[PDB]
């Protein structure tokens, strides 16, 4: 009851993050970095996924918030080689590029040196590590292209 000293004992929503419904990019301060995308490029699908899991678990143990873990579209490139005593290119092998991205935020400037040192020391063979600041273009690169929108935009140009 309101007048009783036990008023408000049942309150619970002040302990819960307000969830009242794409995502705004939060730039970091002078001492903390903003949203960061940790790209993991490799020719082996297992290596890319396994290291992304390792990075995701590493951040949790380091109390670093992980915004989102997702996979970039697979790139398939044909590999052709020139035949001996010939001028014709013949297909040799097919290579698929797999990219895994782990999105983190709130990284401290002083702690960035330690975090980058640990991840680069554990990088598997054949895996490329690239850490970039999150931008709108990178997020928009995960969506299908819209030729119909482009065609209408060309008329306006």
């Amino acid at each position: 009851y309101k007048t009783k000293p036990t008023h408000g004992i049942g309150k619970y929503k002040h302990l819960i993050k307000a969830e009242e419904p794409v995502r705004a990019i939060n730039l970091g301060t002078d001492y903390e970095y903003g949203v960061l995308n940790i790209h993991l490029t490799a020719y082996d699908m297992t290596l890319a996924e396994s290291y992304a899991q390792y990075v995701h678990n590493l951040c949790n143990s380091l109390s670093i918030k992980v915004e989102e873990s997702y996979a970039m579209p697979t790139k398939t490139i044909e590999v052709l080689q020139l035949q001996d005593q010939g001028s014709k290119m013949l297909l040799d092998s097919v290579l698929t590029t797999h990219e895994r991205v782990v999105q983190i935020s709130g990284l401290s400037a002083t702690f960035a040196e330690i975090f980058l040192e640990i991840i680069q020391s554990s990088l598997p063979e054949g895996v490329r590590l690239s850490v970039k600041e999150h931008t709108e273009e990178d997020f928009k690169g995960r969506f299908k292209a819209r030729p119909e929108l482009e065609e209408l935009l060309a008329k306006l140009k």
């Binding site: 309101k2 007048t3 009783k4 000293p5 036990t6 008023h7 408000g8 004992i9 309150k11 002040h14 302990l15 993050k17 109390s63 918030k65």
Partner: peptide, 29 residues
């Protein structure tokens, strides 16, 4: 009309400033 509580209210030790950084239960047990 209000009356102050006779003692420490529940969940008073919870720091609401760092609610995002606070560890959650995440489980029923």
């Amino acid at each position: 009309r209000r009356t102050p509580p006779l003692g420490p209210m529940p969940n008073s030790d919870i720091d609401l400033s760092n609610l995002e950084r606070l560890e959650k239960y995440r489980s029923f047990d």
